[PDB]
Amino acid sequence: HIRGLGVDADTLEPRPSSQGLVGQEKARKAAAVVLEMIKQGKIAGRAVLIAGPPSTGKTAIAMGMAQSLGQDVPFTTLAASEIFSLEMSKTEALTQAFRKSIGVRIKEESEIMEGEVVEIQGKLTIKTTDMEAIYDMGSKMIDAMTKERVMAGDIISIDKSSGKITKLGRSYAFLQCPEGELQKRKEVVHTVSLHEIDVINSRTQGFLALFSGDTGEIRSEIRDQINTKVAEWKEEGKAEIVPGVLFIDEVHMLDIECFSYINRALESDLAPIVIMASNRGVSRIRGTDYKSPHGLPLDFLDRVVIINTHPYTPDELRQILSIRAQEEEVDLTPDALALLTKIGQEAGLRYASNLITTSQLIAAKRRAKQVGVEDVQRSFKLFYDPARSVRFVQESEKRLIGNDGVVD
Amino acid sequence: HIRGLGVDADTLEPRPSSQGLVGQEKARKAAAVVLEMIKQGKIAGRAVLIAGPPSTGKTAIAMGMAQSLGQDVPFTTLAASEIFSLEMSKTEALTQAFRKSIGVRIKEESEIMEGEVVEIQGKLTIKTTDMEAIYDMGSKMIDAMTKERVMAGDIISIDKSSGKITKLGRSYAFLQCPEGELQKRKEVVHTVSLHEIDVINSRTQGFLALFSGDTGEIRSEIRDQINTKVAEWKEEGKAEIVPGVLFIDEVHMLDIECFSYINRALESDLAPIVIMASNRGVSRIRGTDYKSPHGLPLDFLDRVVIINTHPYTPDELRQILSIRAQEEEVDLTPDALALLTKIGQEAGLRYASNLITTSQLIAAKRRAKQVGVEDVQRSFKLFYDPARSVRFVQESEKRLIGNDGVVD
Amino acid sequence: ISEVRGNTRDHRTAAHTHIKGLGLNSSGIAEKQAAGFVGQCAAREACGVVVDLIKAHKMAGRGVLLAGGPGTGKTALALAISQELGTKIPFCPITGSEIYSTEVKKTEVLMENFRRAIGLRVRETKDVYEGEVTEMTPETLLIGLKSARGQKKLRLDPSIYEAIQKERVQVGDVIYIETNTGACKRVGRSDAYATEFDLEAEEYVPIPKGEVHKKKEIVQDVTLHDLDVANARPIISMMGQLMKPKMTEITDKLRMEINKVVQKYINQGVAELIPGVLFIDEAHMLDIECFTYLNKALESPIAPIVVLASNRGIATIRGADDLKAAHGIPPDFLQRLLIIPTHPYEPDEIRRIVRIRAQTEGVQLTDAAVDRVAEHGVRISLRYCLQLLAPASILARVNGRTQVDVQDIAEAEELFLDARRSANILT
Ligand SMILES: Nc1ncnc2c1ncn2[C@@H]1O[C@H](COP(=O)(O)OP(=O)(O)OP(=O)(O)O)[C@@H](O)[C@H]1O
After folding, report:
1. Fold of the CATH domain A1-100+213-312
2. Among A59, A68, A26, which residue's Cα sits nearest to residue A277?
3. Which of A381, B87, B310, C99 would you call most buried, defined as having the most Cβ atoms within 10 angstroms of its Cβ?
4. Which residues bind ADP 3 (chains A, B) (predicted)?
């Protein structure tokens, strides 16, 4: 869905809606400066901080930071809460996160399936200008291209070694059909993260891992075999270490012991771009008795580079909800989207996005091809936003204000 | 001492003083309804809660609940504080309590000593209409029948397998002397609790257990042998599982982890009748940050069935102290008991009961067969009640009010 | 798996046996009085939409939150969500306080409850052919089987002929063959040709009971936890057996043996696993480490529907350095679910509920007694007044009556007082 950063190459002035990104020009222009600061070597071992109101495309801006660095640089999302797990030490939880960010570039010989598609757990048939063949769909392969939104007639390249499907284009509404036989083994660059090499070489996770058993805690013995092989590949010239970008969300939740590890991992010359994201104005530090602005220690605030996102305008919100409406395959009347964006004004964007999927089912029961205002007004009255739900409980708990207008 | 519940069979209207129970009609009538609620299957897996002022026969009402269920149903008293032990996990402390409540009925062949007694560490002689024999008293046997208050001339039945002495009656002030020889082996029903089977099959506790060593923590290996044998006896038809009654006192002291176990043990189809007892009006929950009425979690109060005891009237208190006076073998003047009950009005019943044993020794030093008012007035002035003792310390610590009448 | 029987905590759902589901018409609008429900139209319709979202597979990493006071139809609506999803679906009602255990971890108890919310629908129809072997060679094989009470000869298909040649056969061998792509052989095994000289042999198998041809019908509806609790034993007594503090019978390695056999039954197409509903009351009581387990749980496709309920407005996040949030749910998990508000019932609505519960429990009562008990449903909670039905029926039976009157219900309040009134009386 997200194409890139959506900024000008020379002037670095961002477009209102470009490269899968909508609005937030101030933050995206500041994001473009940070990328240039690292490239010139001006900023060395410095974290980024995307502060702002909730649901202001904070993940998307950092997703833009990734694609604008290199062709295949690793980007990983980590919520600060996910670190505090019942089984897996918060050290291993953070080590996995950093290893998910650092990748290695190796040129490998692997077969790539290239050709036009003729669509139907299932069976999807492929075609070339010379040969035709039927292929039974794998359970994980179905979930892989549905996220890519692959339709019949599309020209695609499926690398069998990685499993990634890449949309090269289309023959009819354009790129023409490939000549030879589908599977062709070529010298292609493979970028696999350190954590992925660990999970490949370590014991395969059995079906229903959350049902019972230990988490993805990679053994120190296995990780050693990978680290020593990567170090041997660096010297040989076989592998090229590429530092990606780690995105940390809910940063206020991080303990003082986490920040000491983050700086220890940031100390390395091949450290990734650590992007922090705080949705809070004023928050206390965890582990430390003292309070701070975004929940960062007195030492981190001076090192970090802060960027601020702003609240979306009704016109900025207009397309965001329509893009999400098309992605969820729903058809709305112009009045309904205007109402849905009006919800996004006082209540959150995320709450308004939830009302999209709920209104579709009520419209399905009415048997209509257009989701209208009365269909949206229902979802708002059936399902409450956090601020309204708490208001509902508070009044039911104790009647704070009487009929007379007297308090208590 | 306690004969039963002391209630009518048909109308369920309790008598003022019957079956070893005095007063508390409101609570005893409510107790009788609960028993009928379980019998009809109306109440399924529901705890009882005897709330009220301290020393209002809360143990006695629950003791009445037991005897009114079945002939030999197990009843066990447990104070919430006793669970938090220095050696023995509070899980084992609670498992022992529940196993003390569940019993098994097996018909066994065992000799029972039946005959008249001619009384004297000691030596008590027995007699029948056909034979006469002398028997040396065992240290534990002396303590067993002194609690039963066995006097010379009484007709008793001593089951040698259990060790329990049962008063069948008397020949002279009536039941006549048994015919044959004393020891007769008959097919009698034996009801021994799960915990008692564990303590019988496990290693025998050596003399002076509190002097040193681990507590009565029954090994998981021993408990397994009993559980598997009981399960094998249920299928055979040899044993009949009988769920007794567990009495939990000082309930406000229980942790959130205890209530989760109580509900887990209450979940069983063969679970005992869990009776809770709170002497507090408003008390905070332990383990949980929130406060509640009797110290029970927000989830327990709705499941539990609450019964309330009331403060005893001077006429209700009149016989309670006289019953305890006879039990402790003391002789009081009518004026002294009137004074002792007057103590029980402002100060507790338990404090007034303590003044009975203390006044006897002062009367013994005066060499009198009647304990009078001046004998009771002494104990009150020598020994202070909790509310008076704290008052005494507070004034000695800091003179809160001066001679002028000025505070601070 | 046939021997495995489902053990369910019926005491939790005992107060809701009067509810048959969710009362709503074809368009989706809730009825005034249907499926054992009175009022709560707004909340009924709201979760009446979430059931369709599950069926349409549009609940991508989503849950439900029931916001409202005590006795506002919260636990009741959760049971309705299961009842409307399908037939013989798992409904696991928990309270945040249950997680707070002494021996097991905060999620070792939350794990088994998730296993108690994911079921298995079995529909296996097998054609049994048990007995000895009496070989005949036709043009593709004739074998005569001998059972304890029957004898039959059958002309086998050429498909079985290839399968029998792989696993060595001789005349006088006890066999278990299936028409539904099944091959199983017991080489030389027969109790008929067993001498009393050898005891430690065990190489022989007894003659199969009944007839050779048997039609085995297997229709099983059990949760994942039922498979774990039945395979833990080295089973009728187990429904009342739990007296052990450690509870070391369920180990991670035992669950792996269940996960592999369940996967094998899915691959064969014999039985598919169906996710149900996990209900969590006192949602605010849950630790921050529990919510992160739930975040990981909701992302899985096998996961059941996580329905939470919170009676609190603003509550501190458990497991965090005092952070006040809505209903005590952290932001990370608050956005993850949609909130459904549950409205309190007015006195007129309360007496309509009483008449439904009394009819189910089997308690006959006068019209005036319903009014007096509804007055306690508005002054005190809905649970307390509903609890007065059982003791008052006993008080009436004692008085010789079947119909419960005001005088009988007046004594019930005198004998059995609520947690609020019992506290204030002590002073
Ligand atoms: N709308 C209703 N129609 C019929 N019965 C109802 C209705 N709402 C609540 N009840 C009944 O009230 C009784 C007690 O309430 P219950 O314990 O279920 O509270 P709840 O709101 O469902 O959940 P919580 O325990 O979280 O308050 C139950 O028998 C329940 O079915």
Report:
1. Rossmann fold (3.40.50)
2. A59
3. C99
4. 264
C chain contacts of residue B36, beta-carbon cutoff 8 Å: 394
User: Hey, are the CB atoms on B299 and C95 less than 8 Å from each other?
Assistant: yes
Please determine whether the domains at B1-100+213-312 and B313-408 fall in the same fold group of CATH.
no
Q: For the domain that residue C178 is a member of, what is the CATH number?
A: 2.40.50.360
Sorted by where each begins, the domain ranges of chain B are 1-100+213-312, 101-212, 313-408
The rounded distance, in Å, linking the Cα atoms of A401 and A408 is 7
Strand ranges across the sheet with C271-275: C221-223, C118-122, C271-275
For the Cβ of C107 lying below 6 angstroms from any atom of ligand 1, the answer is no
Q: Which segments within B57-133 are labelled E, that is strand?
A: 75-79, 102-118, 125-127, 132-133
What's the gap in Å between C89 CA and the centre of ligand 1? 21
Count of all residues that appear for chain B in the document: 408
Classify each residue of B257-292 as buried b or exposed e, where b means 16 or more C-beta atoms within 10 Å of its C-beta: bbbbbbbbbbebeebbbbbbbbbbeebebbebeeeb
Among candidate residues A40, A97, A35, A107, the one with its CA nearest the CA of residue A70: A35
Residues B216 and B205: their CA atoms lie apart, in Å, by: 8
Ligand 1 binding pocket mutation candidate from C11, C74, C350, C387 (most atoms within 8 A of CB): C74
Q: What backbone phi and psi angles, to 5 degrees, belong to C192?
A: -65, -40
Q: How many CB pairs under 8 A join A and C?
A: 138
How close does chain C come to A136, measured CA to CA in Å?
16
Q: Cα angle at A235 between A233 and A239, to 5 degrees?
A: 35
Q: Which of A77, A135, A117 is nearest to A101 (CA)?
A: A77
Q: Are the C-beta atoms of C164 and C186 separated by less than 8 Å?
A: no
A379 is in an annotated binding site: no
Give the Cα separation of C21 and C273 in Å (integer): 23
C153 Cβ neighbours under 8 A, 6+ residues apart: C134, C136, C142, C143, C144, C145
Chains C and A touch (3+ CB pairs under 8 A): yes
Alpha-carbon gap, residue A301 to A306, rounded angstroms: 9
DSSP string, B266-313: HSSTT--EEEEEE--SSEEPBSSSSEESBS--TTHHHHSEEEE--PPP
Contact B307 C415 (CB under 8 A): yes
CA angle, corner C276, sides to C273 and C282, nearest 5? 145
How far apart CA B240 and CA B104 sit, in angstroms, is 5
User: A313-408: which CATH topology?
Assistant: Helicase, Ruva Protein; domain 3 (1.10.8)
CA distances to A41, A359, B347, B378 from A367, rounded to whole Å, are: 60, 12, 77, 92
Taking the centre of ligand 1 as the mean of its atom positions, its distance from the CA of residue C72, in whole angstroms, is 6
> Does ligand 1 have an atom closer than 6 angstroms to the CB of C353?
yes
Which of C82, C353, C361, C381 has the most ligand 1 atoms within 8 A of CB, as the residue to mutate? C353
* Interface mutation target, options C262, C338, C340, chain A, most CBs of A under 10 Å: C338
- Give the distance (Å) from ligand 1 centre to CA of residue A402: 27
Domain of residue C352 covers 347-426
| Resolution rounded to one decimal, in angstroms | 3.6
For ligand 1, what atom is nearest to the CA of residue C19? 31
DSSP annotation of B9 reads S
| Residue C40, number of CB atoms within 10 A of its CB | 25
**With an 8 Å Cβ cutoff, are C426 and B263 in contact?**
no
Residues of C whose CB is below 8 A from A390: 67, 313-314, 326-327
Task: Output the CA B292–ligand 1 centroid distance in Å.
Answer: 21
Q: Token pair for residue C50?
A: 């979430």
> By what method was this entry solved?
X-ray
